[PDB]
Design an enzyme around this catalytic site. Structure first.
Site, PDB file in Angstrom:
ATOM      1  N   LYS A  97       0.816  -1.208   0.000  1.00 29.76           N
ATOM      2  CA  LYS A  97       0.000   0.000   0.000  1.00 29.76           C
ATOM      3  C   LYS A  97       0.856   1.268   0.000  1.00 29.76           C
ATOM      4  O   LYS A  97       0.555   2.209  -0.723  1.00 29.76           O
ATOM      5  CB  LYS A  97      -0.945   0.014   1.192  1.00 29.76           C
ATOM      6  CG  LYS A  97      -2.154   0.900   0.944  1.00 29.76           C
ATOM      7  CD  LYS A  97      -2.813   1.355   2.228  1.00 29.76           C
ATOM      8  CE  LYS A  97      -4.141   2.035   1.932  1.00 29.76           C
ATOM      9  NZ  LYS A  97      -4.316   3.293   2.712  1.00 29.76           N
ATOM     10  N   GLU A 131      12.335 -11.773   5.970  1.00 29.07           N
ATOM     11  CA  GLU A 131      12.629 -13.046   5.341  1.00 29.07           C
ATOM     12  C   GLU A 131      12.062 -13.016   3.903  1.00 29.07           C
ATOM     13  O   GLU A 131      10.941 -12.610   3.684  1.00 29.07           O
ATOM     14  CB  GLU A 131      11.990 -14.147   6.150  1.00 29.07           C
ATOM     15  CG  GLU A 131      12.132 -15.519   5.551  1.00 29.07           C
ATOM     16  CD  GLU A 131      11.309 -16.554   6.292  1.00 29.07           C
ATOM     17  OE1 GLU A 131      11.288 -17.677   5.771  1.00 29.07           O
ATOM     18  OE2 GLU A 131      10.728 -16.262   7.388  1.00 29.07           O
ATOM     19  N   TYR A 132      12.885 -13.394   2.946  1.00 28.97           N
ATOM     20  CA  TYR A 132      12.463 -13.582   1.567  1.00 28.97           C
ATOM     21  C   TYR A 132      11.685 -14.919   1.418  1.00 28.97           C
ATOM     22  O   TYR A 132      12.157 -15.969   1.845  1.00 28.97           O
ATOM     23  CB  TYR A 132      13.715 -13.552   0.702  1.00 28.97           C
ATOM     24  CG  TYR A 132      13.562 -14.020  -0.713  1.00 28.97           C
ATOM     25  CD1 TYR A 132      14.419 -14.983  -1.230  1.00 28.97           C
ATOM     26  CD2 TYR A 132      12.570 -13.518  -1.523  1.00 28.97           C
ATOM     27  CE1 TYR A 132      14.287 -15.414  -2.545  1.00 28.97           C
ATOM     28  CE2 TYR A 132      12.426 -13.952  -2.832  1.00 28.97           C
ATOM     29  CZ  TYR A 132      13.310 -14.901  -3.326  1.00 28.97           C
ATOM     30  OH  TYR A 132      13.203 -15.350  -4.619  1.00 28.97           O
ATOM     31  N   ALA A 133      10.486 -14.839   0.822  1.00 31.52           N
ATOM     32  CA  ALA A 133       9.647 -16.002   0.521  1.00 31.52           C
ATOM     33  C   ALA A 133       9.727 -16.252  -0.993  1.00 31.52           C
ATOM     34  O   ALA A 133       9.095 -15.571  -1.768  1.00 31.52           O
ATOM     35  CB  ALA A 133       8.227 -15.786   0.939  1.00 31.52           C
ATOM     36  N   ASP A 161      -5.846  -9.907   9.238  1.00 30.83           N
ATOM     37  CA  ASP A 161      -5.711  -9.602   7.808  1.00 30.83           C
ATOM     38  C   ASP A 161      -5.117 -10.795   7.080  1.00 30.83           C
ATOM     39  O   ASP A 161      -4.229 -10.674   6.230  1.00 30.83           O
ATOM     40  CB  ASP A 161      -4.863  -8.333   7.633  1.00 30.83           C
ATOM     41  CG  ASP A 161      -4.966  -7.715   6.266  1.00 30.83           C
ATOM     42  OD1 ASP A 161      -6.029  -7.841   5.589  1.00 30.83           O
ATOM     43  OD2 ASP A 161      -4.017  -7.053   5.794  1.00 30.83           O
ATOM     44  N   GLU A 198      -3.040 -12.547  -0.360  1.00 30.82           N
ATOM     45  CA  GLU A 198      -1.932 -11.657  -0.674  1.00 30.82           C
ATOM     46  C   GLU A 198      -0.960 -11.482   0.494  1.00 30.82           C
ATOM     47  O   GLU A 198       0.146 -10.991   0.276  1.00 30.82           O
ATOM     48  CB  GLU A 198      -2.406 -10.289  -1.180  1.00 30.82           C
ATOM     49  CG  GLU A 198      -3.556  -9.674  -0.398  1.00 30.82           C
ATOM     50  CD  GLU A 198      -4.944 -10.039  -0.976  1.00 30.82           C
ATOM     51  OE1 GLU A 198      -5.602  -9.137  -1.578  1.00 30.82           O
ATOM     52  OE2 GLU A 198      -5.385 -11.207  -0.846  1.00 30.82           O
ATOM     53  N   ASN A 199      -1.343 -11.907   1.695  1.00 30.28           N
ATOM     54  CA  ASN A 199      -0.467 -11.859   2.859  1.00 30.28           C
ATOM     55  C   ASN A 199       0.028 -13.238   3.317  1.00 30.28           C
ATOM     56  O   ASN A 199       0.537 -13.364   4.429  1.00 30.28           O
ATOM     57  CB  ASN A 199      -1.195 -11.177   4.030  1.00 30.28           C
ATOM     58  CG  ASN A 199      -1.486  -9.736   3.772  1.00 30.28           C
ATOM     59  OD1 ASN A 199      -0.756  -9.054   3.038  1.00 30.28           O
ATOM     60  ND2 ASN A 199      -2.527  -9.226   4.433  1.00 30.28           N
ATOM     61  N   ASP A 204       2.725  -9.813   6.841  1.00 33.25           N
ATOM     62  CA  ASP A 204       1.980  -8.553   6.904  1.00 33.25           C
ATOM     63  C   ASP A 204       1.173  -8.382   8.205  1.00 33.25           C
ATOM     64  O   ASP A 204      -0.056  -8.483   8.223  1.00 33.25           O
ATOM     65  CB  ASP A 204       1.077  -8.394   5.683  1.00 33.25           C
ATOM     66  CG  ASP A 204       0.578  -6.995   5.538  1.00 33.25           C
ATOM     67  OD1 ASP A 204      -0.176  -6.730   4.575  1.00 33.25           O
ATOM     68  OD2 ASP A 204       0.887  -6.086   6.358  1.00 33.25           O
TER      69      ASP A 204
HETATM   70  N1  LIG Z   1       9.002 -11.361   2.288  1.00 33.96           N
HETATM   71  C1  LIG Z   1       8.431 -11.391   1.065  1.00 33.96           C
HETATM   72  N2  LIG Z   1       8.901 -12.201   0.077  1.00 33.96           N
HETATM   73  C2  LIG Z   1       8.372 -12.183  -1.199  1.00 33.96           C
HETATM   74  N3  LIG Z   1       7.349 -11.324  -1.507  1.00 33.96           N
HETATM   75  C3  LIG Z   1       6.892 -10.505  -0.543  1.00 33.96           C
HETATM   76  C4  LIG Z   1       7.407 -10.545   0.752  1.00 33.96           C
HETATM   77  N4  LIG Z   1       6.757  -9.666   1.522  1.00 33.96           N
HETATM   78  C5  LIG Z   1       5.822  -9.071   0.727  1.00 33.96           C
HETATM   79  N5  LIG Z   1       5.898  -9.592  -0.543  1.00 33.96           N
HETATM   80  C6  LIG Z   1       5.047  -9.194  -1.663  1.00 33.96           C
HETATM   81  O1  LIG Z   1       4.709  -7.814  -1.509  1.00 33.96           O
HETATM   82  C7  LIG Z   1       3.300  -7.691  -1.344  1.00 33.96           C
HETATM   83  C8  LIG Z   1       2.957  -6.610  -0.323  1.00 33.96           C
HETATM   84  O2  LIG Z   1       3.606  -6.905   0.900  1.00 33.96           O
HETATM   85  P1  LIG Z   1       2.891  -6.612   2.279  1.00 33.96           P
HETATM   86  O3  LIG Z   1       3.839  -6.917   3.392  1.00 33.96           O
HETATM   87  O4  LIG Z   1       1.636  -7.432   2.387  1.00 33.96           O
HETATM   88  O5  LIG Z   1       2.568  -5.032   2.100  1.00 33.96           O
HETATM   89  P2  LIG Z   1       1.217  -4.334   2.593  1.00 33.96           P
HETATM   90  O6  LIG Z   1       1.259  -4.217   4.089  1.00 33.96           O
HETATM   91  O7  LIG Z   1       1.225  -2.991   1.888  1.00 33.96           O
HETATM   92  O8  LIG Z   1       0.051  -5.226   2.160  1.00 33.96           O
HETATM   93  C9  LIG Z   1       2.812  -9.066  -0.930  1.00 33.96           C
HETATM   94  O9  LIG Z   1       1.429  -9.252  -1.167  1.00 33.96           O
HETATM   95  C10 LIG Z   1       3.745  -9.953  -1.709  1.00 33.96           C
HETATM   96  O10 LIG Z   1       3.297  -9.998  -3.047  1.00 33.96           O
HETATM   97 MG   LIG Z   2       0.130  -4.319   5.604  1.00 33.29          MG
HETATM   98 MG   LIG Z   3      -0.221  -7.119   2.698  1.00 35.53          MG
END
Ligand SMILES: Nc1ncnc2c1ncn2[C@@H]1O[C@H](COP(=O)(O)OP(=O)(O)O)[C@@H](O)[C@H]1O
Ligand SMILES: [Mg+2]
Ligand SMILES: [Mg+2]
EC number: 2.7.11.1
Length: 261
Positions: free
Chosen positions: A18, A86-88, A131, A135-136, A149
């Site tokens: 966001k 951490e990278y996923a 939440d 996407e999280n 997230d």
């Molecule tokens: N650690 C991660 N490894 C790989 N992709 C990630 C990782 N963290 C976030 N992402 C990607 O970035 C997007 C947004 O991250 P997020 O932490 O959910 O941000 P927000 O709080 O704005 O929703 C995720 O939906 C995913 O696609």
């Molecule tokens: Mg968030």
């Molecule tokens: Mg998110």
């Protein structure tokens, strides 16, 4: 441990958040690969959710579970805050669903089990995520599910900040009532349905219509959904939170037992 941007080589955007993007990054001295979540301070304060960022860091950094995404720390400069994550490597469950359209019972049951274990660990500390949505939910290198997230997370008993897509939130949450750990149980139900069906059960073209659907708990199953799955989902999607099962009861549900890896 005082990190700065200069300690990292930044790579491709992993996703759109966001308040900024998440980037692949490598720490220069160790060559450690991780993800850097960027949030623009201007936008955060305007939105008035600086407290959510604080909670994310404080809650997520102390949790230690194979199905919870690790947060290693954070830093900031003038215009941005940087969360070191951490990278996923296998991406989100959201992308996985759009690739496959819907999951078989085995993959679903397995993800629900991983989610239920991660949530058991959280709720043991009275942390409610609030939440849980595709996407999280991220995928590790073995394909294991990781809750990420934690910006909406809070210690239970809580009230509710303004919202977004309502699809995964229980009636008590959308209506702004007091709520607790049972919030995540509802979300588990929504996710089980979406994994099996390809769309969330209260999906509607309008927020207002979605709200109505959730509040009345009006959903139906396509014919292909099995009676075991229907039974689990129907037990989780109860308007009254006290009628929702405990996570133990989900982990030992016969459909989960017969289908989970
Ligand atoms: N650690 C991660 N490894 C790989 N992709 C990630 C990782 N963290 C976030 N992402 C990607 O970035 C997007 C947004 O991250 P997020 O932490 O959910 O941000 P927000 O709080 O704005 O929703 C995720 O939906 C995913 O696609
Ligand atoms: Mg968030
Ligand atoms: Mg998110």
């Amino acid at each position: 441990r005082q990190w700065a941007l200069e300690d990292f080589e930044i790579g491709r955007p992993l996703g759109k958040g966001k308040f900024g993007n998440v980037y692949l990054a490598r720490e220069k001295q160790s060559k450690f690969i991780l993800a850097l979540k960027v949030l623009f301070k201007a936008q955060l304060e305007k939105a008035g959710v600086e407290h959510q960022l604080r909670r994310e860091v404080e809650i997520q950094s102390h949790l230690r579970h194979p199905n919870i995404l690790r947060l290693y720390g954070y830093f900031h400069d003038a215009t941005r805050v940087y969360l070191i994550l951490e990278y996923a490597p296998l991406g989100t469950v959201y992308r996985e669903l759009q690739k496959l359209s819907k999951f078989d019972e085995q993959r679903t049951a397995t993800y629900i089990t991983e989610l239920a274990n991660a949530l058991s660990y959280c709720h043991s500390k009275r942390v409610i995520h609030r939440d849980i949505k595709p996407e999280n939910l991220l995928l590790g290198s073995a394909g294991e599910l990781k809750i990420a997230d934690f910006g909406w997370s809070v210690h239970a008993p809580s009230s509710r900040t303004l919202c977004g897509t309502l699809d995964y939130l229980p009636p008590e949450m959308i209506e702004g009532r007091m709520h607790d750990e049972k919030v995540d149980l509802w979300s588990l139900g929504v996710l089980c349905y979406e994994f099996l069906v390809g769309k969330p059960p209260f999906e509607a073209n309008t927020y207002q219509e979605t709200y109505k659907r959730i509040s009345r708990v009006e959903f139906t199953f396509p014919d292909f959904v099995t009676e075991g799955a229907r039974d689990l989902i129907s037990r989780l999607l109860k308007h009254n939170p006290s009628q929702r099962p405990m996570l133990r009861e989900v982990l030992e549900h016969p459909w989960i037992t017969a289908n989970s890896s």
